Symmetry: D3
Subunit: 320 residues, 6 copies
């Protein structure tokens, strides 16, 4: 049973913000400075997740949380530690940008893990108590690693986003596969930022957000895009539809955003003008989807909509 | 013509004061608008018309016509304005922003930052704010902040402009040019450069012309923006200068202080924080009233009021020339 | 008798903001745009200060102010002018970043003085009416000059911060001495920005804030640190303890910040996301300290704490 | 009778260097540092030109020169000074990049003229003794202004190259017309730099060189292209064919260059790795063309070819 | 195999010495070649073969096969090498540079910097140097300086690489990766970073693998390039390291001094001034002789010679680990 | 007796290169990569110097050398190590840019000393065998520190050049005084780069070269200037005359350079297009001066001229 608020009266938008935003405040932990990625999944008869909680030292750590209702979170004060046989991959430097999904028999966590710069860390859990760390999937510099929630033609699949070691001024989404969660390959380009004249909210760089959502015609991808203004980056998010069998083949890609920084909690904070989607919960029998997104790199917010309406919007407004 | 007006508050000593109704145009007036923050406004018939920059939810820059009975409450067309053009190449639409409008002699002219292998100044005319006829782009890229004078200067059309680059330009002088025919342009003259940081830092990075010049007996009143580069971005403020009536590239007085700078929440939070960008004015020489339209945070449109003679006085008193 | 508010009920922070913030508004003077450094000291029956008041031409000027309570200030409308026999040094270009302290027999004012670029200007006063300018202490480019409030083994001492001629993307704190307030030397490195992975609020650049506060466990240094986000700089502030006798030797340095931009008056304004500490009043008998800080380069705020608590926080959280 | 050297036996190149290169040395004048644009034309008995000669102050000045054979030049020691009735336009700041051609009844000179940054200066001369300055054709920033040698459908026509106020990192060629040599307009884009993967010698920026040469198949445009290596720009040059009646319409554009820096005089100098074409003399009866080019921004060189061979090369290798 | 060789010049105390015949390959060997400066060379039958980076007079980067009896005088094919691939997406040619070639078990493999939405490491194999069969690109962009080990390491193929950007990259660490199958890659391990400027400035900006690692009893001998960033550009020098045999990401010794730096006119002047870029080596374990191929000023190819044990001695003696 | 070559026949230049250049080659020492500052003085029976010799690790080290004739040098293989009781200042990181002169009773050496970035190191020797390190004169970032060869009104005096921590894109010359060779002050701006349109060889940055040369008319300062081309920096050098009593007051300053990179040893090497003057020897009786200068940051060269001729050239071509 997923978090839900009905479409506000008179609202014509395909996605609408929770009137209770933010749902997770910056100061939930005794030394939290900000809490703004919430990689959430159903777990048991409630919910679990891995949260980016930056502390008052501005260190980036991951913490486990649990919730009965997916809105009020009980986040562990101790940062998440990963078990690793290999001491060098198991060395912690930093971590941010978590994503979590269930694949076949267990939950997988990806995050941007420091190993001589940003790359994609990978781990699994059965219980959100012990996490077994796997090889980093890629060589740096890479982030916005997002696994598909089932195998594709008998291989694990992940979207990713080649980066640099700074505030990267570019970014294409890529797709890769693995037979074993250890060795990765068959890299395919998915998409590039759009031209400024076509769709400027996604003209500087783009990156995958929540775990891809399967629909009968393809994968619904919710992804961030950046616009470079004279005064900074503005992060908005939107939707695309990927081919089911070869998800690097993009079928439709929204011209308009789904959501952009509007509210004071999106516009003011540690990084102004940021809506960064990180997770979603959905129900295919009602079409309902709830999208979790970071707000100003400070707090966490929720937005709601219907999958069929998002799909119709993505096709009708498509730039491809 | 009855222009909008609010009297200055009790105890306010400022030369310009904001409308208590700001923002006068909201970001979501149209079903697909993301922001509406340039308002090129003129008297038209028994009321007012304008060309508005309305950026949509794809963050595309388009121009839309609007009409108003009082110049405060606007009815803006949902569909973007399309230009008619004799020439297919010039007529091709890439993007448009930064509109300005004025009447010269027998018709309304519209200039805008028109994409043609980069930003340049598009030119068109209209008799009715329904059909627009596009003329040659006035200049080669890169250029924007094109603003016509509202009459010919010694028998030639005249336009202020602002040589630019293809990004968020880190420099910018105002220039003046003439044309006998609205097709060929020349006699380019430098008007002014940014001020020295230690003299007037609100206008030390770059400058550009705003509203159409307003003719006064003490010269053309130019209201123009200026940029300060802080560690966290650009701050856009605006101020005033007086140009020679006959040779308007000769600046006679230029203000040290700004007239208006970002202060209010609607100016300090939005798509581009800390921007007050003036785009149009309405004025009444009988009363000396002036109403200046300005975009706020690249999100919404606001209005500010003052008196022409008080602005002239301020410009002279505080002149850095 | 220093300004004080009790720590809010339930508040676990070492420093807490005044509920009266901002204490100095942007428009206090007829031509002020912003008022955000407040170099304050006790004087006579109350308080005096040197204030950075940027005007509506965005020029950077210094003005003298007086207060009876150190909260409600009466600032002179006319900028401060300095007396100097040397016309070359005496030439005013611009001035910002003032700091003020009494040393032995008079008050000294330092500021970021334009002399072919930013350097540290120096002047004294006996009465806060007439100010007499001394030689600039250093060659450009330097700022964040902050004198010790007594001589150190017989010499005047000053912290500074080598810079460039723009929005400096680096910054270490240095220490220098002078026998005579004219010739300076014995330059020693104090500290550098921390590593991003250890303490990111202070990983781009740092600079000294208020006059050092003598304690039995060392000089308490309150200093700003910068984090470079994709959208610009975020200024926070924290604490270090310097050796009493050789103050370039850092004994303890906080990991977490003491204060970071949170309130709308800190997050929105001429320069968003800035808390810049400029002065402090303290009472060794009660342990109370009141720290003045510029907010968003627009207004002035106050924050309160106890010196023993700040000492304890600095030591327990030390990254060295 | 234009200069000529026959193609060496076995030489397969479309263009070949004079064996006498450099034809103008850097120290020809008592104060010359370098001499490296040579805007040459037939005049009377022999030849005349306008030369960029940078002095030992590294100032950029134009000088008039005369030659019997177009190879050995007698350049005037004193810079060229223009007569102008408008004192504002007639103010000399700097000048470089000259081009000279006869149109109708007199010689026109264009150059990169300082007027609050680079723009295209214009003047005329009947005798190469007195030069009369006209209005600058465009607003800054622009350079590489090159006139057509006759009117095009009753209007003067000029190629130009919108620029910035530095070492410009971009550059498209544009075309403009004027009824009167005063007011300019009908601006049209001619061509942009090529894609890196298609033709990298011309992928950063391009600019017109010699006066266009009229042929039955279009205007022969010889133009420079830049490649941005890790160690700077490399200037090469190539060929295109423009429509006769509407010269902004490009018919053919070479993939390969015609000439690139190879010789020590091209690869070592004030600006290493530069071949910058500035003029040509040609003879339609024989098809001979002689192209003048600056070498390393230090000296002037000559290269030879046949117009029909250049045309066949431009077509065969066309990237349009 | 008879590897090229010249004895050390009389009086010469350097560990490596340039051929007196340099450049051994000129820039205009082919009718349309602009420059020829990577030479990925191996023994083949009775002579030598290689894959050469020949940039053309359009300044396109292509790979060409060549053959030589002596490894000094090369017969390079006029037409660029084409790869067979049955996946059209991966088999699309955009550009290629930076080849390296070695024999592993049953065939020759060739890696190169292959354009696939930016630089990455392309991989192919050949049995005969006539037909080349392309495999998956080994990594996601941006990467280059991919260099295979000449045997499997504990049953897996192994490759050095170099994470990059899509420009003239201002950074660069060498990495190591493994693959069981020449298709999927993983077990990524950091090998080394640029040195500190105050320790060894020829290798302080970025580093990258050069020739195929050469196996010694004392480790893998890695010859690699290093960049120094002067006010006027990058200077590429090359030096030596020894890697653990079994875990080649563990560096045992790393030279402080360079082995070779741009000195000669053919190294200092050309398309990219001040570049010595090593691309291949031939060696003879019986004699200890090694011949190192290197690109000179991105224009021509040179040769340098030395003795493996003397290089090992120098690497240990001068080690900055 | 200082080295001398008479001006080549007909040569009209104020300064002329030695026909023996380069006088010091790059490979004098077993591990030298380049040898290109040579801070030279008369000593005992001949000459002594401190030389910048970068090694084959590209480390910057200073070495002592001696010569009978000041042309052919015997440079010590071992780098120079300074004696210093203070362990903090005595720590060696790197050193370059040496300058040497005799002041009153001993030889002083300054150099660009690494101390948390570049600053001016200072030391003395009586014998060119043992060198005794003093305090760094300034806080970083600074270089091109050049002492005057006597006291000025009872104080030691030094030119310097505020910098940054990279390849500095700016640079003015400053003057400072010290009563004791420990504490420094009375900082005065000497000169800034010229405007591009006035004198482009010196329009990016400038810095002092050889020790100032006393004349009856003022101090002859030989200094470098930088021009920023598209392909890098070009270092040339020229002359100014400073007031004898107040040497920050410039009396005349040359518009043209004295010398600029022309020869292959100046235009090809580790840093192309560099002539960097570092020391001079002179004879007041004859007016002869021999100027040592770094060539392409690879080798050392010599140029000769006459002090009165240099002075008249500086006056006649003065840009102030
Ligand atoms: C603590 C901090 O500033 N972290 C940021 C991270 O939030 C961001 O996503 C990345 C890219 O812009 O840069 C930094 O790693
Ligand atoms: C869509 C968008 O971000 N447009 C901006 C425009 O508003 C701005 O005026 C111009 C110059 O700074 O840059 C961009 O074109
Ligand atoms: C008027 C203005 O913008 N002044 C700022 C000043 O506040 C700031 O501290 C300094 C460094 O960032 O740069 C500028 O001088
Ligand atoms: C003196 C000097 O360096 N002049 C150059 C000029 O030669 C060049 O064409 C232009 C663009 O790169 O920049 C500068 O004006
Ligand atoms: C054609 C051309 O300039 N190619 C270069 C290539 O040689 C170089 O290795 C790379 C990194 O600097 O940049 C470009 O791809
Ligand atoms: C080894 C090396 O590259 N040193 C240079 C030095 O020669 C130069 O003067 C300084 C300023 O450009 O930068 C670097 O420190
Ligand atoms: K795709
Ligand atoms: K003017
Ligand atoms: K210290
Ligand atoms: K065209
Ligand atoms: K390692
Ligand atoms: K001076």
């Amino acid at each position: 049973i997923i978090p839900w608020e009905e479409r506000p009266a008179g609202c014509k938008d395909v996605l609408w913000r929770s009137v209770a935003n933010p749902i997770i405040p910056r100061d939930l932990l005794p030394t939290s400075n900000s809490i703004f990625n919430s990689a959430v999944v159903p777990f048991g008869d409630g919910f679990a997740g891995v949260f980016r909680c930056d502390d008052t030292s501005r260190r980036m750590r991951l913490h486990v949380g649990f919730s009965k209702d997916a809105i009020n979170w009980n986040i562990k004060e101790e940062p998440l530690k990963f078990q690793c046989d290999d001491e060098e991959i198991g060395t912690w430097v930093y971590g941010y940008d978590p994503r979590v999904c269930f694949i076949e028999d267990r939950y997988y966590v990806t995050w941007c893990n420091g190993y001589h710069g940003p790359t994609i860390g990978v781990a699994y859990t059965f219980d959100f108590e012990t996490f077994h760390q796997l090889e980093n999937a890629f060589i740096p510099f890479n982030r916005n690693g997002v696994l598909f929630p089932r195998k594709i033609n008998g291989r694990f699949a992940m979207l990713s986003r080649p980066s640099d070691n700074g505030h990267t001024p570019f970014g294409d989404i890529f797709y890769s596969e693995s037979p074993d969660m250890e060795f990765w390959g068959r890299h395919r380009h998915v998409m590039s930022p759009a031209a400024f004249e076509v769709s400027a909210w996604q003209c500087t760089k783009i990156g995958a957000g929540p775990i891809p959502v399967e629909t009968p015609e393809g994968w619904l991808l919710i992804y961030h895009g950046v616009l470079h203004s004279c005064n900074g980056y503005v992060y908005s998010f939107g939707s695309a539809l990927l081919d089911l069998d070869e998800p690097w083949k993009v079928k439709f890609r929204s011209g308009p955003y789904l959501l952009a920084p509007r509210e004071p909690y999106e516009c003011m904070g540690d990084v102004p003008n940021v809506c960064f989607p990180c997770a979603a919960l959905h129900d295919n029998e009602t079409g309902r989807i709830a999208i979790y997104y970071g707000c100003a790199d400070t707090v966490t917010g929720l937005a709601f909509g219907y999958i069929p309406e998002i799909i119709e919007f993505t096709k009708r407004t498509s730039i491809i």
